[PDB]
Amino acid sequence: PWPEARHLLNTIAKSRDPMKEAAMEVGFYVPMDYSPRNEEKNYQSIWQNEITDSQRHIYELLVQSSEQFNNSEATYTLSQIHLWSQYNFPHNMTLAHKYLEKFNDLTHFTNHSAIFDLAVMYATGGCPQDSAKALLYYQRAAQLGNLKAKQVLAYKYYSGFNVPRNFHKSLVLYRDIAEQLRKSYSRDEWDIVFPYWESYNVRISDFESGLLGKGLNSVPSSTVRKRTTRDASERRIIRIYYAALNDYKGTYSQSRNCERAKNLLELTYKEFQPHVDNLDPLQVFYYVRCLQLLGHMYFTGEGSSKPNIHMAEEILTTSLEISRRAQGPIGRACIDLGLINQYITNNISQAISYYMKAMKTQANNGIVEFQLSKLATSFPEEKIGDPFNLMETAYLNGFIPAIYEFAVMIESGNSKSSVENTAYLFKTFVDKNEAIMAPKLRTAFAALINDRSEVALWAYSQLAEQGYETAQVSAAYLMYQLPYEFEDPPRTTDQRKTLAISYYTRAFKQGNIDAGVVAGDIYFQMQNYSKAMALYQGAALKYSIQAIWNLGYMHEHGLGVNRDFHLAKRYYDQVSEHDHRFYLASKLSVLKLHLKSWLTWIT
Amino acid sequence: SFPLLLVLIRTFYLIGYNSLVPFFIILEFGSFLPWKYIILLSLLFIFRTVWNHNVLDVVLRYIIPDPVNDRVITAVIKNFVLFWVTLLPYVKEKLDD
Amino acid sequence: PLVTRLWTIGCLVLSGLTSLRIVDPGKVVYSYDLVFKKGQYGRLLYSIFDYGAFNWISMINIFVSANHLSTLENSFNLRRKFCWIIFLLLVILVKMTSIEQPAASLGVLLHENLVYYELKKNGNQMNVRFFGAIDVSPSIFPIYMNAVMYFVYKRSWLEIAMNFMPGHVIYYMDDIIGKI
Amino acid sequence: MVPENRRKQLAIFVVVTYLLTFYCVYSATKTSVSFLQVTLKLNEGFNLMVLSIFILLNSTLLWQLLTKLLFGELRLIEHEHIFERLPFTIINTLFMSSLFHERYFFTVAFFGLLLLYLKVFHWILKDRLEALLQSINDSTTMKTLIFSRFSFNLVLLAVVDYQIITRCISSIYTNQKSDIESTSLYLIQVMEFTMLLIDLLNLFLQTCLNFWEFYRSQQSEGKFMYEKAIDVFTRFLKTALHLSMLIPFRMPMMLLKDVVWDILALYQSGTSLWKIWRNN
């Protein structure tokens, strides 16, 4: 039956990601609690009133196909349907488990995708967990030649979680993964121009209030890009520059679109070119900025068929000419001039000149030093810096391939070649290329902005294990948020909490701070009172205000420590000392202390 | 001068947040201070518990347009009749509409 | 602003020396009608500024006037017509006061009517708008002010009418030419 | 004092402020996570104004009851003197606060506020003294308990100011920190409470003089001479301390205004001096 089944399936448009459909021409809802009964009843309602008849036919045909016959190709795809919530069917977490089990049976440890997903599901206990089976499956899937499996094993051997810490085996895995990744990139994309892919590595809850209160949290909000911004004559070039940008580097809610940006830049260049000389005060600034942007779009080939080299060259040289007067910035322009006259034409001294011109500018990220050191190692007699220092500054600045090149250059040399630094470099690279390893962030966020909340928890969970911190704090936040005061705590099953605590804690040990405080609060709610102090003190050591104050409140009440009113006063003095705006609170709390004391003094 | 409240009420329009303004209206009208304040005592205890025509142009109309005609006295007459109603803001902007 | 502060210090020294009996309070009360028979011009000139008492109520009153003047005078270079008006304003009241000689002094009337005229001028500017409860603008208060004043404080009808009626005639003469 | 509708206006003011502050507390509560946030929220502008007004209202109420405990009830001439003298004082206080901007915004207020209430007491006492002067009854001598109660009010205020002055001097000597403006602030409050203490000494000498007078009258020149001599003594002390403490500040205005009203008082002192030389 399956042939006609697939011919059916070819029509129904697996998933719609409004982040792209909103690119032709806000926020979301998270729940605070959960209930298995409510979920089952939601599912019954969805199957009762929402689905269409043709889909009824499709699904019954699928179950009969993958049931009567061990077709091994309705099983997998039906697993994928029920798990990733595609083809508009509901998300059923137990049916996906059953069918992935059946698949692994049929195919006898031959397919690594289902092995990976079964491993995640046996490690998070969503479906109790058992690390033994998880590690067995991870190893077995690493045998088959997967990537994510190798990453998760490497991380697990690096943060010391669930197995002893060992930098050396971690280093082996990471060097393996980095080598494969380098071999995945062509010669053009590597040296010349790095392909541009949006990241969704922004941790969630950076959109709503924030974590542990507004204006109170220590780690800086990380949403790098969202709707950049800042009566007729001036404002036109402003508005057009902002439309061009806001459709070049797409935001989180709406993806990017280059075609309209290219057409609009060409239009405005042709329409403004004849009478530029009258726009001296401020409009030449944004005008030349747009002009440089158009030139770069020509040189790259985005939003078109193929690059237009020579036209771009004239555009950039004229941009630089018009900028010579009015002393406008010359960064991207000179950088691309150098990139061109280094590979397009073979006149190098000018490239040296341009790089030296733009080195100190603001907009250079890493291209300058990288290309320059490759030159110097290819041409030693130029007397241009030193390979190590150049590449080092590059790595520090954040250019991707420079990370891996510098790490290789440091592996051959001592130059303080501790195992920690090498493991750290390679882990940063693997984590930060992000374009092949973890695209699932995109799928996740998309599934999030249209009311399918559960599947977002699933995807962010599967990402947790690989180590992308933002996945960790996001999945946590989706499982247990801090409750508003004078209000009941959430009503989730305890298993969810015993996972959320672990995700938060690992997030802490990774380098985040506030997650510690939220973990401590989860404990203090679940009534441990004992392990909390450790997290709180470790956070105090990293200057977390709400933490210190909370530690105070811990002391001056009978939990754990016993009524050491002196150190309590000391802690509140601290909270007032380290920062200012909390002055009143420290004071008034010492006042409550004084009142308790002087009142029990009377008896 | 004037009643001590209204002056300050007006001068709020310059520098201060208008937030402080409306309370004075209470101070003013509640200035009649009825023992119906028990109503206000009720009222506040209800506060607490929230939680736990084109013809006018025909009127504007004058005889023998245009205004250039010699009967300017009639013009100021008609506009005087409007002036008696030109007080109303709600229809002043309507005149401007 | 200078001329504002001139008017200010005038009011200050006037009402001050008035409260100290350094000069005779008999002269200030003098309005036009008694002056027509008497023939004493200056007994209204001082009256341009007087408020009587050098105390806090009067202090704040003077500062209110100063606020309206800092609002208006530095913005009166825009509307030259105020020069064309004030004399006429100083004019129009006369037959008007020819019945009562209101104890309200000149500068009082003058500045309050300038407020009235500024409110009528930019009435559309809803530059203060408490959303949800008070969705209002200028040219809605002054009627609320004066009319209710008549009700609760129970002053003289025509005497209060003098507070603004000249200003309304001025605004009339402003808009009629824009209409004719 | 208090008319009927004014009493009802103040009942209204009280109740509306209680309701506003309660509402603001509850609002800033149910949109927060932990105590520390709600503390950072009450400091926001509007609720800051509501809370500040709440503080002032309960402060004046407390002041009212403290007074009704100390002085019993007030007399008319007292009340007219108070209500007439109030504005010049209040404006003096507002002059004092504004001389420092937001930086030293709150603390000075407290100081000023206390000063204000203190002045009130002093004034009443003065007339009350005159009352004891007027209604003095020779049916009994000024027994140690009568004198003790008058001096009870006296020494109450005296120890108040003395403790305050000395504590401020200590806070000066301790806080030799980068914020010298706080030093000058403490000096100013010193000057004010010093003028107050000098007023107390004036009263002290007047009453002890009448004490010695009546004492010798019961056991055994023209008193006016010594009265005015003491007046000039007190005012010389006033001016001298004004110079010695404000010249360090080199204050452009308060220094000058103070010493101006001082030299006018000194012209009056010359009046008294020629009176004495007539009566010497």
Side-chain angles (χ1 to χ4, degrees), chain A, chain B, chain C, chain D residues 1-220 222-280:
Chain A
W2 170 248
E4 183 72 329
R6 202 180 86 167
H7 194 195
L8 266 294
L9 302 184
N10 262 16
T11 72
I12 312 95
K14 296 186 288 185
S15 82
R16 53 182 216 103
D17 43 358
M19 303 177 299
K20 176 168 287 190
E21 294 167 10
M24 325 295 297
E25 79 189 14
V26 288
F28 40 66
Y29 307 109
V30 308
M32 203 169 292
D33 36 359
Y34 152 83
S35 297
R37 295 311 179 260
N38 201 310
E39 287 260 358
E40 288 175 353
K41 311 323 175 176
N42 222 312
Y43 169 79
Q44 301 298 335
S45 176
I46 290 292
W47 258 87
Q48 216 76 357
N49 306 351
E50 198 277 332
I51 317 172
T52 81
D53 201 331
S54 88
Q55 300 177 118
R56 263 88 165 279
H57 172 207
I58 301 148
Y59 183 75
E60 65 93 11
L61 176 77
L62 264 297
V63 60
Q64 201 255 337
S65 158
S66 194
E67 176 58 57
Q68 196 58 69
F69 292 160
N70 319 133
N71 191 28
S72 176
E73 210 68 359
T75 286
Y76 173 86
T77 179
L78 183 46
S79 154
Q80 287 316 300
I81 303 147
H82 268 174
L83 187 143
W84 278 98
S85 177
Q86 49 187 344
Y87 300 139
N88 307 326
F89 286 175
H91 166 105
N92 300 320
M93 178 52 201
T94 182
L95 278 192
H97 193 194
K98 172 179 187 296
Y99 284 23
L100 270 175
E101 185 60 35
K102 180 188 305 305
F103 178 109
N104 183 38
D105 307 311
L106 294 180
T107 306
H108 297 287
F109 270 51
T110 318
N111 195 317
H112 59 53
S113 201
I115 286 182
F116 188 58
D117 296 345
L118 182 52
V120 167
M121 281 163 54
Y122 278 155
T124 75
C127 186
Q129 67 255 51
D130 48 291
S131 285
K133 281 193 55 58
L135 214 43
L136 264 49
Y137 275 64
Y138 281 168
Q139 295 269 54
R140 174 54 189 172
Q143 300 289 348
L144 259 62
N146 197 344
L147 289 93
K148 297 169 189 45
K150 291 184 179 182
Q151 179 188 2
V152 62
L153 285 178
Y155 170 68
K156 193 174 292 263
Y157 286 4
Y158 183 91
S159 159
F161 178 77
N162 188 34
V163 293
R165 195 179 208 170
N166 173 309
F167 288 29
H168 204 94
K169 191 166 287 295
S170 91
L171 166 62
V172 165
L173 287 190
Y174 275 107
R175 196 194 309 108
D176 186 8
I177 297 189
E179 186 93 357
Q180 282 217 31
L181 279 167
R182 175 52 158 98
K183 282 315 177 191
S184 174
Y185 277 169
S186 66
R187 183 261 167 183
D188 213 348
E189 302 181 343
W190 187 262
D191 316 304
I192 303 315
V193 52
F194 210 80
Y196 181 99
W197 186 53
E198 293 92 359
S199 161
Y200 272 99
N201 200 6
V202 53
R203 64 170 77 80
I204 203 187
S205 71
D206 299 359
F207 307 149
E208 299 276 358
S209 76
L211 181 59
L212 64 62
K214 199 162 211 308
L216 148 68
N217 45 14
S218 156
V219 64
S221 88
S222 161
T223 69
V224 180
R225 48 160 179 159
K226 44 176 317 179
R227 187 171 170 71
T228 57
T229 187
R230 185 62 64 97
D231 186 279
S233 87
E234 290 190 34
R235 208 67 185 178
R236 186 176 183 178
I237 201 61
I238 293 184
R239 189 187 169 280
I240 187 175
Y241 182 69
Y242 281 175
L245 208 58
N246 267 10
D247 278 350
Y248 187 51
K249 318 161 185 298
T251 57
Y252 297 161
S253 315
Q254 170 205 35
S255 64
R256 72 180 294 207
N257 192 330
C258 181
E259 295 86 337
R260 101 180 75 179
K262 189 263 163 186
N263 287 6
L264 176 139
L265 259 294
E266 176 66 69
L267 177 142
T268 186
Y269 163 71
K270 177 144 57 57
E271 184 166 323
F272 264 67
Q273 169 53 41
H275 47 99
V276 303
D277 213 353
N278 317 320
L279 299 97
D280 197 349
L282 193 69
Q283 312 166 104
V284 74
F285 203 61
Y286 296 1
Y287 164 79
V288 68
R289 194 72 65 83
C290 313
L291 202 141
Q292 277 170 344
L293 190 46
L294 171 77
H296 150 83
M297 307 149 60
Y298 276 171
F299 182 45
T300 319
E302 302 162 352
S304 163
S305 297
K306 45 197 188 301
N308 183 348
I309 302 169
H310 59 286
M311 176 84 99
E313 165 180 19
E314 293 103 14
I315 291 180
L316 275 300
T317 184
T318 67
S319 68
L320 187 61
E321 281 221 349
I322 189 176
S323 175
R324 194 52 187 187
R325 64 174 179 262
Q327 52 273 8
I330 69 172
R332 310 282 285 278
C334 303
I335 277 173
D336 289 89
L337 284 173
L339 214 179
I340 287 183
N341 65 352
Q342 176 174 324
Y343 300 89
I344 298 298
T345 174
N346 308 99
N347 203 66
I348 303 182
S349 158
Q350 297 189 13
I352 320 302
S353 70
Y354 286 125
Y355 297 147
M356 300 310 291
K357 286 182 56 178
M359 187 174 308
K360 289 102 192 173
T361 76
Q362 181 266 0
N364 66 349
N365 43 12
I367 311 144
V368 196
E369 299 80 333
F370 179 47
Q371 282 286 348
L372 191 58
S373 93
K374 283 191 67 175
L375 261 289
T377 186
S378 162
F379 302 89
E381 292 75 11
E382 278 52 26
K383 301 179 289 295
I384 44 170
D386 165 90
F388 191 84
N389 214 348
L390 303 179
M391 296 279 219
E392 180 195 30
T393 321
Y395 150 59
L396 305 160
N397 282 308
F399 187 48
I400 300 180
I403 287 188
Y404 159 80
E405 278 279 11
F406 174 71
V408 158
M409 264 193 55
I410 214 161
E411 182 167 342
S412 87
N414 165 259
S415 278
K416 315 312 280 292
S417 66
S418 175
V419 66
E420 172 270 357
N421 281 147
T422 302
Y424 179 72
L425 286 196
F426 281 141
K427 190 211 175 198
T428 283
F429 174 55
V430 161
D431 280 342
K432 212 165 285 300
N433 79 341
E434 198 265 332
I436 316 173
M437 319 285 312
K440 297 264 148 287
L441 282 152
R442 210 178 197 279
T443 303
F445 200 93
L448 187 65
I449 71 185
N450 62 5
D451 267 326
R452 271 78 171 273
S453 158
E454 181 65 12
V455 65
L457 170 59
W458 156 260
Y460 275 126
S461 162
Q462 163 194 306
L463 281 174
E465 307 296 331
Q466 302 160 354
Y468 280 103
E469 156 200 355
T470 73
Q472 301 188 335
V473 56
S474 190
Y477 185 98
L478 267 172
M479 271 172 305
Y480 190 118
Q481 323 183 14
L482 276 181
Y484 278 160
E485 199 155 358
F486 286 157
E487 192 182 4
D488 221 21
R491 313 197 203 281
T492 174
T493 65
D494 55 358
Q495 177 268 350
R496 206 81 73 97
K497 282 189 257 194
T498 201
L499 170 66
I501 57 172
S502 57
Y503 281 174
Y504 271 128
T505 314
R506 201 173 306 133
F508 185 98
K509 298 200 194 320
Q510 182 86 40
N512 187 78
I513 303 183
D514 51 328
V517 172
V518 183
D521 193 326
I522 296 294
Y523 279 159
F524 180 37
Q525 147 68 51
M526 213 189 179
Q527 286 198 346
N528 185 31
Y529 305 87
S530 45
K531 210 160 195 167
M533 295 318 145
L535 295 183
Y536 280 93
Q537 286 150 324
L541 205 74
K542 295 214 196 72
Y543 297 153
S544 46
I545 292 90
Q546 165 68 48
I548 277 176
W549 186 106
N550 199 271
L551 188 41
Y553 174 94
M554 284 315 199
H555 275 292
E556 77 96 10
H557 264 71
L559 57 85
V561 284
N562 316 78
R563 298 180 187 270
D564 176 351
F565 283 50
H566 180 52
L567 270 177
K569 169 183 172 166
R570 181 174 303 257
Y571 274 140
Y572 301 0
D573 188 1
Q574 285 153 250
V575 68
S576 181
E577 186 177 2
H578 295 245
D579 201 6
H580 204 53
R581 309 180 314 276
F582 310 116
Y583 177 62
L584 198 159
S586 64
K587 289 304 178 196
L588 201 161
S589 202
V590 192
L591 196 150
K592 191 253 278 188
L593 196 41
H594 274 165
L595 192 137
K596 293 230 173 188
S597 44
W598 264 80
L599 264 292
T600 317
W601 177 260
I602 303 314
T603 302
Chain B
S1 183
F2 262 17
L4 69 162
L5 277 61
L6 299 83
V7 288
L8 177 144
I9 301 175
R10 260 213 324 269
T11 198
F12 268 120
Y13 274 162
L14 197 143
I15 200 66
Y17 280 100
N18 58 335
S19 45
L20 301 150
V21 186
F23 310 143
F24 293 90
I25 285 89
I26 291 173
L27 278 76
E28 287 285 54
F29 284 169
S31 178
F32 289 165
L33 293 156
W35 282 76
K36 304 179 184 188
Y37 83 105
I38 197 152
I39 313 189
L40 184 71
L41 176 55
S42 176
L43 184 141
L44 256 58
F45 279 150
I46 302 167
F47 198 106
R48 162 188 172 99
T49 183
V50 187
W51 305 124
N52 311 332
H53 50 255
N54 66 337
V55 180
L56 70 90
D57 279 28
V58 179
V59 182
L60 265 69
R61 184 179 66 85
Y62 49 90
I63 196 179
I64 309 104
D66 296 331
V68 287
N69 301 290
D70 305 328
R71 274 170 283 299
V72 54
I73 194 153
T74 73
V76 60
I77 285 159
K78 306 327 167 194
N79 217 312
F80 174 87
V81 191
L82 322 172
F83 171 105
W84 270 109
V85 73
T86 201
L87 72 89
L88 287 174
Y90 173 47
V91 286
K92 186 276 159 193
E93 296 101 10
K94 180 179 190 158
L95 265 295
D96 198 16
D97 288 331
Chain C
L2 169 66
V3 196
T4 47
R5 293 195 263 281
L6 169 147
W7 207 303
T8 290
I9 180 63
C11 283
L12 317 173
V13 306
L14 259 292
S15 280
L17 301 160
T18 315
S19 158
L20 320 183
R21 269 68 67 192
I22 288 305
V23 285
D24 314 329
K27 314 220 284 183
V28 302
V29 59
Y30 276 72
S31 180
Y32 178 72
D33 184 22
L34 299 95
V35 157
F36 183 91
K37 300 181 179 60
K38 184 58 181 180
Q40 195 38 254
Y41 287 86
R43 270 182 147 141
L44 267 180
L45 270 295
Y46 285 164
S47 161
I48 292 294
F49 323 90
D50 183 30
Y51 284 160
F54 177 40
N55 74 326
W56 73 307
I57 309 181
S58 58
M59 285 300 290
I60 303 166
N61 188 33
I62 301 148
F63 290 125
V64 179
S65 45
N67 300 355
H68 297 344
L69 306 194
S70 44
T71 320
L72 291 154
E73 269 52 37
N74 309 343
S75 42
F76 273 166
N77 301 285
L78 323 172
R79 276 85 165 182
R80 301 186 186 283
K81 305 184 312 182
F82 91 98
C83 312
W84 156 266
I85 290 165
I86 66 163
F87 271 93
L88 304 188
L89 199 40
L90 196 167
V91 161
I92 175 61
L93 51 89
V94 296
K95 161 81 172 175
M96 307 282 84
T97 176
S98 178
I99 313 305
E100 311 202 35
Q101 303 264 269
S105 176
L106 314 164
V108 201
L109 318 160
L110 276 302
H111 86 91
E112 299 198 299
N113 284 111
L114 265 296
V115 181
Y116 178 82
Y117 197 67
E118 192 44 68
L119 266 62
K120 281 287 304 200
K121 177 50 67 182
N122 69 343
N124 63 273
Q125 293 175 356
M126 301 142 198
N127 301 340
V128 165
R129 270 272 297 274
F130 176 26
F131 301 158
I134 317 173
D135 298 331
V136 301
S137 40
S139 177
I140 318 167
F141 169 81
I143 180 64
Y144 158 76
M145 180 173 91
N146 56 24
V148 171
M149 278 160 53
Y150 153 70
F151 279 71
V152 55
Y153 290 91
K154 188 68 72 176
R155 221 63 47 86
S156 189
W157 166 52
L158 303 152
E159 218 155 11
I160 302 314
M162 273 184 92
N163 286 130
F164 87 114
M165 189 49 61
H168 220 192
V169 190
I170 304 148
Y171 200 83
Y172 168 99
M173 302 300 297
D174 168 34
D175 65 68
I176 57 180
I177 184 167
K179 195 259 188 179
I180 285 186
Chain D
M1 274 280 194
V2 299
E4 53 279 13
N5 77 332
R6 185 182 295 276
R7 285 199 63 144
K8 257 298 167 295
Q9 270 203 359
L10 291 194
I12 288 302
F13 200 41
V14 156
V15 58
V16 63
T17 285
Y18 273 185
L19 260 289
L20 256 287
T21 186
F22 182 94
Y23 175 84
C24 289
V25 155
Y26 185 93
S27 158
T29 287
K30 289 308 288 186
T31 70
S32 174
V33 162
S34 64
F35 190 111
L36 185 51
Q37 179 197 358
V38 81
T39 296
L40 194 147
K41 233 175 199 173
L42 288 183
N43 200 23
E44 182 178 300
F46 174 62
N47 305 355
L48 163 60
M49 280 310 166
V50 156
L51 284 181
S52 197
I53 278 179
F54 167 92
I55 292 178
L56 286 183
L57 210 65
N58 190 279
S59 73
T60 48
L61 265 285
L62 167 84
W63 178 77
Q64 194 93 17
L65 261 288
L66 198 170
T67 288
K68 284 180 75 73
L69 195 138
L70 263 289
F71 287 57
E73 184 42 87
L74 311 96
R75 299 175 286 106
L76 283 177
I77 319 107
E78 324 179 321
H79 164 77
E80 277 89 9
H81 270 164
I82 303 147
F83 216 70
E84 187 186 340
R85 280 204 215 252
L86 279 164
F88 296 91
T89 72
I90 299 161
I91 303 283
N92 183 297
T93 66
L94 291 179
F95 195 113
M96 297 296 180
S97 92
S98 317
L99 293 185
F100 325 131
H101 203 74
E102 284 201 2
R103 296 87 53 83
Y104 295 90
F105 187 77
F106 291 103
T107 181
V108 292
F110 174 59
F111 281 91
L113 290 172
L114 199 56
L115 169 48
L116 170 67
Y117 305 144
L118 267 296
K119 266 185 186 285
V120 184
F121 297 116
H122 283 78
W123 278 307
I124 314 183
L125 209 173
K126 176 149 75 181
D127 289 345
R128 199 45 71 101
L129 177 63
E130 312 280 322
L132 177 47
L133 181 145
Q134 182 267 356
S135 188
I136 189 154
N137 188 14
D138 313 331
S139 61
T140 64
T141 82
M142 290 177 72
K143 305 310 177 178
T144 183
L145 271 297
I146 325 173
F147 177 80
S148 80
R149 181 179 180 274
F150 203 93
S151 295
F152 182 28
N153 314 325
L154 263 293
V155 300
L156 195 152
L157 310 179
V159 296
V160 170
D161 63 62
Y162 169 64
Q163 179 180 198
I164 296 162
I165 302 149
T166 68
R167 188 223 60 102
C168 299
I169 311 164
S170 275
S171 180
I172 308 166
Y173 206 108
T174 287
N175 277 319
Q176 312 288 351
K177 315 167 304 202
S178 295
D179 300 12
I180 303 307
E181 284 65 33
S182 178
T183 319
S184 161
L185 152 65
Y186 294 143
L187 316 184
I188 301 147
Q189 301 306 111
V190 175
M191 191 279 316
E192 294 298 20
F193 285 134
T194 298
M195 294 181 52
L196 271 301
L197 172 134
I198 294 169
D199 307 311
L200 284 202
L201 270 70
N202 185 0
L203 295 174
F204 181 76
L205 306 159
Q206 282 146 326
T207 299
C208 295
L209 169 147
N210 195 6
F211 178 25
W212 206 341
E213 170 271 340
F214 198 71
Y215 183 77
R216 296 194 318 186
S217 158
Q218 300 323 102
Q219 281 291 342
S220 186
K223 45 192 181 305
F224 291 172
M225 308 155 204
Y226 290 80
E227 305 168 0
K228 282 59 159 183
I230 294 169
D231 304 343
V232 189
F233 177 80
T234 72
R235 304 164 178 190
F236 200 103
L237 177 63
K238 288 185 169 186
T239 71
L241 188 147
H242 284 303
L243 173 149
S244 47
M245 183 176 282
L246 287 65
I247 293 312
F249 193 28
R250 281 317 186 293
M251 172 72 207
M253 317 195 177
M254 180 171 174
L255 183 39
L256 277 294
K257 179 217 64 52
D258 213 324
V259 303
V260 159
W261 187 237
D262 283 328
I263 67 156
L264 274 291
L266 304 169
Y267 205 113
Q268 317 285 10
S269 84
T271 299
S272 309
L273 173 148
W274 182 221
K275 290 182 182 172
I276 303 315
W277 276 104
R278 295 157 45 217
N279 304 275
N280 197 277

